[PDB]
Write a protein that binds this ligand. Structure first.
Ligand code: HEM
Ligand SMILES: COc1ccc(C(=O)O)cc1
Length: 393
């Protein structure tokens, strides 16, 4: 009853151009079996949404990567939020929700916006820049580590540690094994900065530790919650901002709409998250036999959710392969859905918004003027290099 496919969604050929194979996965049926890795897959919006919103049946505590924590030891101590289920997930989640809350955004927005304006001013003096290294990477690195309260030394470990985390979600292919092989210095730095004395007052890290006396988390749980923000707080924001610039360069008509109304900046970034989905995939593990889209899945089975495919499913979206900055993006799963829905989504949206705002007000044209190079990652989609010429407005 279940179609079996040989598509490897963690192969370089798939990463290079995933959209044909994603249509093949969607159109084969609501539930497929991927013979390459012995996992079930769901690529349509309907099933991805249903799986995300049943955390009891499709749990996260056995890992959201390929590895089943009931069978293999995790490569690091499990995340207290990403790799936990309710009720254990609930109170650590509440702490991170308050640390990255709407009220918190008010305290950082002025500085985040000023740094975005300053970066675009700087890039316009150069003219021809690399929109990844010089913009999508440079800007989040200039605001988020400071907002965490991290010292200056050792920050070069942050993006390599994130690449380790996201490649480690994948199967034991070369991308994963090579990341783990080189991991030791990046893990050592990150684990050390999670300790309370190393986090500057007022920052995200210090605020997590401050919650340890409310009864929501214990003192020994605070370092791992800081670890979550150091794991996830940068790489997808980089990829999302790079995706947005990529979209505005490929769809000049949408840049012109954004220039004419800079208040479209927030939705232009949200549409970029739907369109290029920085997080392509996450796994769940069945806790029981379950019927999903007319398919019977046994207990203890890994289910691969194609978030990027769900965000381009024509059963849900009109013209899904068009970048439309006034699209009603509500309901896309680029940040997930349900109880694990990205707790740092307000930070990512703030950075994306103020950067696209600076571009909307300061830049007249964005033209690719060099070879575009893709970055390969078992879990993330993003660019390695995006040479563009910025023309001032
Ligand atoms: C464009 C940027 C981002 C994207 C596309 C993204 C994507 C996602 C997705 C899809 C999930 C769901 C995980 C699941 O369902 O298993 C998630 C969760 C999470 N994200 Fe993000 N994220 C982004 C930015 C951030 C930022 C900036 C932070 C921290 C400052 C962050 C921290 C987290 C954490 C801690 C979780 C776990 C939440 C939970 O398990 O309850 N992310 N993210
Ligand atoms: C890629 O998204 C995430 C989310 C959470 C974590 C974590 O909690 O460690 C890591 C990566």
């Amino acid at each position: 009853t279940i179609p079996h496919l040989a598509i490897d969604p963690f192969s370089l050929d798939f990463f290079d151009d995933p959209y044909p194979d994603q249509q093949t996965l969607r159109d084969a049926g609501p539930v497929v079996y991927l013979d390459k890795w012995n996992v079930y897959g769901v690529a349509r919006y309907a099933e991805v949404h249903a799986v995300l919103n049943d955390p009891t049946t499709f749990c996260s505590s056995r890992g959201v990567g390929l590895s089943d924590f009931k069978k293999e030891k995790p490569w690091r101590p499990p995340s207290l939020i990403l790799e936990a289920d309710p009720p254990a997930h609930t109170r650590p989640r509440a702490v991170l929700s308050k640390v990255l809350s709407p009220a918190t955004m008010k305290t950082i927005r002025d500085g985040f916006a000023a740094a975005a304006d300053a970066k675009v001013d700087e890039l316009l003096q150069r003219g021809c820049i690399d929109a990844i290294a010089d913009l999508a990477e440079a800007y989040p690195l200039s605001v988020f580590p400071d907002a965490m309260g991290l010292k200056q030394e050792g920050r070069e470990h942050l993006l390599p540690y994130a690449g380790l985390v996201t490649n480690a979600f994948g199967p034991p292919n070369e991308l994963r094994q090579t990341a783990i092989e080189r991991s030791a210095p990046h893990q050592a730095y990150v684990n050390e900065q999670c300790q309370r004395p190393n986090l500057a007052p007022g920052g995200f890290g210090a605020c997590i530790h401050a919650f340890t006396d409310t009864g929501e988390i214990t003192p020994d749980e605070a370092p791992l919650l800081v670890r979550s923000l150091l794991s996830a707080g940068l790489d997808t924001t980089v990829n999302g901002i790079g995706a947005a610039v990529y979209c505005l360069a490929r769809f000049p008509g949408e840049l012109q709409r954004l220039r004419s109304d800079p208040t479209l900046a927030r939705n232009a970034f949200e549409e970029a998250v739907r369109f290029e989905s920085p997080v392509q995939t996450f796994f769940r593990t069945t806790t029981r036999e379950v019927e999903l889209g007319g398919a019977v899945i046994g207990e203890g089975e890994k289910v691969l959710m194609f978030l990027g495919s769900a965000n381009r499913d024509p059963r849900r979206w009109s013209d899904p392969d068009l970048y439309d900055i006034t699209r009603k993006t509500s309901g896309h799963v680029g940040f997930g859905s349900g109880v694990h829905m990205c707790v740092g989504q307000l930070v990512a949206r703030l950075e994306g918004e103020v950067m696209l705002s600076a571009l909307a007000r300061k830049v007249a044209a964005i033209d690719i003027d060099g070879p575009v190079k893709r970055r390969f990652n078992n879990t993330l989609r993003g660019l390695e290099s995006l040479p563009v010429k910025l023309t001032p407005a």
